[PDB]
From Swiss-Prot, chains A, B:
<feature type="binding site">
    <location>
        <position position="134"/>
    </location>
    <ligand>
        <name>ATP</name>
    </ligand>
</feature>
<dbReference type="InterPro" id="IPR038729">
    <property type="entry name" value="Rad50/SbcC_AAA"/>
</dbReference>
<comment type="subunit">
    <text>Homodimer. Forms a heterotetramer composed of two Mre11 subunits and two Rad50 subunits.</text>
</comment>
<dbReference type="InterPro" id="IPR022982">
    <property type="entry name" value="Rad50_ATPase_archaeal"/>
</dbReference>
<dbReference type="InterPro" id="IPR013134">
    <property type="entry name" value="Zn_hook_RAD50"/>
</dbReference>
<feature type="binding site">
    <location>
        <position position="14"/>
    </location>
    <ligand>
        <name>ATP</name>
    </ligand>
</feature>
<comment type="similarity">
    <text>Belongs to the SMC family. RAD50 subfamily.</text>
</comment>
<dbReference type="Pfam" id="PF04423">
    <property type="entry name" value="Rad50_zn_hook"/>
</dbReference>
<dbReference type="InterPro" id="IPR003593">
    <property type="entry name" value="AAA+_ATPase"/>
</dbReference>
<feature type="binding site">
    <location>
        <begin position="62"/>
        <end position="64"/>
    </location>
    <ligand>
        <name>ATP</name>
    </ligand>
</feature>
<protein>
    <recommendedName>
        <fullName>DNA double-strand break repair Rad50 ATPase</fullName>
    </recommendedName>
</protein>
<dbReference type="InterPro" id="IPR027417">
    <property type="entry name" value="P-loop_NTPase"/>
</dbReference>
<comment type="function">
    <text>Part of the Rad50/Mre11 complex, which is involved in the early steps of DNA double-strand break (DSB) repair. The complex may facilitate opening of the processed DNA ends to aid in the recruitment of HerA and NurA. Rad50 controls the balance between DNA end bridging and DNA resection via ATP-dependent structural rearrangements of the Rad50/Mre11 complex.</text>
</comment>
<feature type="binding site">
    <location>
        <begin position="35"/>
        <end position="40"/>
    </location>
    <ligand>
        <name>ATP</name>
    </ligand>
</feature>
<dbReference type="Pfam" id="PF13476">
    <property type="entry name" value="AAA_23"/>
</dbReference>
Length: 348, 348
């Protein structure tokens, strides 16, 4: 479900022609001027995990200099130590996966089947459960009440149209028109369980469901976040429409009714509660990219002190170009670009 | 979704060596001494609709005399006229289906695929949405509060374990181990939509869902039934656990808190509301088999007068051996067994 990033190592990956980075538990701050190669680090981490896509343009990741790339990630998931190695050289691609120090998967395909079964989530759901994009917090606070519920709906992925069963129940149907031309009955038994299923959703019931699965969860965590962040509100409600209702002393309040500082806390609390909800577990690692961008000096300070109260999450990686945030991290990874080649250094 | 039975015709079907029966809209009473061949009529109707099962013992339906059976059903579904013909003679079976007077399906298999797509439900769900077994009402009223919710859960079919995807996502997986031995990528695209789906239920969320889909529905109809049956209660609640709460003047009441007569009304109301819920539409036809069995003279009378108030359902077939119920029907189909052969006659 949720992992711990241990060590990434890249070769000819975009700006990083040769970089090795070790991550620690606690708060990790990847600090470096804009364009220095920070986001590529995690680009490499994600590429290591799900490799290239179908018909993927390998020029995007390979440092323009040559035609060869190699990334090695050491992560741990639910008590196990994994080492994923993904590489590509001149049209030749490969992938290997190790579990507790022994080979587990040796082929690009088997490595994927294994990775997918280790996380228990797909590429996108996993990405939303661990990576918080630049400006999310500021943008959330900018949206109008009705838009806030919108973004929550998105993060959860409510856009689901199981019409795929069309091709599904059919391509796996005709398979029997070749069984009727003078045992294989099982192939019917499941074509039914396909209808019995597609027959209970209708394309519009799948949403009514998700609101049932997530909302409960999100509200649970949102409340825990509140205690961790010391917000003065015993109960936080989350309507089935994703509206945040803070039960204050004199009556329910909406994020918009709160002070700048408290709004930051709630927004962070919500985005975290959602990440936990996507994986149905308390996240082990969360990566925030330039989370204080678009925030005035006041709200930056607030988030800074809130970061300091984050102890419920084992590993929190904050990427920034603001060096003041250095006073919040337990570890500091400086990144400097040297005329096209990134350099990483763990000091400060 | 829901049909109207027009005409059934059987040949060598159990007790009915040769019987032809026409049904009408309104209340139809199939009256006849125990063992006279009433339930076979509808056995034939159901057999006509879904034919024999896989490796089905044709001695059960074929009149013991010989080895040949033939059933022809004329029903209408959602504005269309259908004629289904199912037959079997000496190991040779066949099936034909006509829509609005023209051939539609000519092979046992194509006839099934067509029938299933016309009803929009499987054999069992359809059977619970149209056939109310003997003693259901009396038994329901006999059960203990906690058992009542139990039976509701059953009728809805909450027993669902999508673990079938095991064989599913796998038998349709290895299909690619034969694609990796030096386009067919689509076969992956849907193996994912299979996980993305099986990955959101977990075998225990599918129930939390059904309660969301049905309960709302059942409560809606239960209330309509109340008005049709003239019950003195503006609102009837149906908890997410399937408990019936009658909002009377002095406080909520449970079926058990009501008078014998009112309990019959509620039970009938509930079993009807469920049938509508299974097909997500107001039933067109409902068949009650010996619904007054196990009911004392009082409660029989009550149900009798309630039957008379049933106008919301286009066709209601009541099978019984009690001739007094004849005073409730718009049409009467007498059934007499003549030493092993049933005889049907529409008089009285
Ligand atoms: N394939 C590549 N080869 C060499 N350099 C690349 C390649 N792709 C991107 N870059 C360089 O990476 C730089 C960006 O690093 P950057 O992503 O801005 O780190 P951060 O996100 O922390 O600011 C760009 O300026 C670009 O020139
Ligand atoms: N294959 C068969 N051939 C001839 N008679 C049969 C066959 N199967 C069942 N029967 C007869 O049908 C009779 C039952 O008709 P029945 O179902 O009791 O009508 P109802 O249900 O309205 O009482 C049984 O007594 C049995 O002898
Ligand atoms: Mg960046
Ligand atoms: Mg920042
Ligand atoms: Mg009977
Ligand atoms: Mg009766």
């Amino acid at each position: 479900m949720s992992m711990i990033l241990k060590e990434i190592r890249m070769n000819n990956f975009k700006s990083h022609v040769n970089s090795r980075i070790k991550f620690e538990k606690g708060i990790v701050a990847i600090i470096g001027e804009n364009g220095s190669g920070k986001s590529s680090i995690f680009e490499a981490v994600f590429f290591a995990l799900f490799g290239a896509g179908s018909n993927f343009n390998y020029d995007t990741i390979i440092t323009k200099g040559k035609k060869s790339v190699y990334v090695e990630l050491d992560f741990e998931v639910n008590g196990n130590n994994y080492k994923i190695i993904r590489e590509y050289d001149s049209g030749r691609g490969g992938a290997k996966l190790y579990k507790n120090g022994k080979p587990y998967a040796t082929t690009i395909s088997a490595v994927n089947k294994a990775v997918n079964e280790i996380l228990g989530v797909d590429r996108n759901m996993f990405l939303n459960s661990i990576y918080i994009k630049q400006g999310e917090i500021a943008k959330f606070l900018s949206l109008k009440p009705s838009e806030k519920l919108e973004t929550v709906a998105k993060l959860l992925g409510i856009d689901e149209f199981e019409k795929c069963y069309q091709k599904m129940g059919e391509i796996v149907k005709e398979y029997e028109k070749r069984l009727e031309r003078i045992e294989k009955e099982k192939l019917t038994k499941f074509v039914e369980y396909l209808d019995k299923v597609r027959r209970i959703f209708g394309r519009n019931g799948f949403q009514a469901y998700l609101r049932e699965k997530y909302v409960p969860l999100i509200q649970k965590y949102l409340n825990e976040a509140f205690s961790e962040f010391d917000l003065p509100y015993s109960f936080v409600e989350l309507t089935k429409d994703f509206e945040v209702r803070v039960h204050a002393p004199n009556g329910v309040l909406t994020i918009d009714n709160l002070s700048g500082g408290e709004q930051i806390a709630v927004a962070l609390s919500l985005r975290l509660a959602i990440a936990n909800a996507l994986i149905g577990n308390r996240v082990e690692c969360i990566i925030l990219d330039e989370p204080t961008v678009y925030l005035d000096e006041n709200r930056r300070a607030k988030l800074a002190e809130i970061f300091r109260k984050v102890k419920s999450i084992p590993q929190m990686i904050i990427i920034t170009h603001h060096r003041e945030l250095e006073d919040v991290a337990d570890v500091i990874i400086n990144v400097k670009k040297d005329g096209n080649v990134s350099k990483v250094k763990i000091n400060g």
